[PDB]
Amino acid sequence: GPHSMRYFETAVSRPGLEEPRYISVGYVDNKEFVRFDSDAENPRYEPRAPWMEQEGPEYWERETQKAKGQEQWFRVSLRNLLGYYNQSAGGSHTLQQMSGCDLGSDWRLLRGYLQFAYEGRDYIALNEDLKTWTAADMAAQITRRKWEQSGAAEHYKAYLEGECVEWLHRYLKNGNRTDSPKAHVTHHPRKGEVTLRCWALGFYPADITLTWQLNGEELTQDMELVETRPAGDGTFQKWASVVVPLGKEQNYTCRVYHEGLPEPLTLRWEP
């Protein structure tokens, strides 16, 4: 199947704190495997998955030394951004970054990524061609022009097509699973009415769809749900409910769609 690696990086300035806090999280296939945090006693990249422990000291020392450069890079960029937007001192500001690569089932590069957000909103991003930049804000054109004259896109294209891909292969090999949902329906009175709640439990990954049908067509209005949420053990949960006349429990059918199933599940309230 397809694979991916991601690095999510954050720099936070606060009202008085003197210098920003820097956090970098690495993901392989949308699961965390390394983390760096400038708040820690001895700030370093630390393994966050058991399969990462097989890397030796000079791997972690090289990653950590890069995270210290990033920390400075974000500090200077937070300072420049303050002036681009004519923001005064004494506020809280955030800088964010997502970078990484997507691989197909053949382990070849599908797409690279490099995006930035200031104050949680899109600031500048590398286009799919890995050659040109998109920057919407007027304050962001200053950065787009600097990065075009310096040719920064070439540096990131080389990283995304080379190191991002090859180190992901190494991570994939060393770490080379989905959990299918278990579903059930519950019964709750509403005098003269009843709600049926279709549960989905223990599934991984998080993407899932729950539908209800009235002996035929889907129910889009009338459908109460919750956003998919982590159980805390690595799996996820979700439910969807509909209000139903008390004698019509069996004219309603829950469907569960998940990438780990042979086919969608089909289930009703069974007393």
Partner: peptide
């Protein structure tokens, strides 16, 4: 393998 930024914003 984490990235290394070049020019600052």
């Amino acid at each position: 393998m984490c990235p290394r930024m070049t020019a600052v914003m």
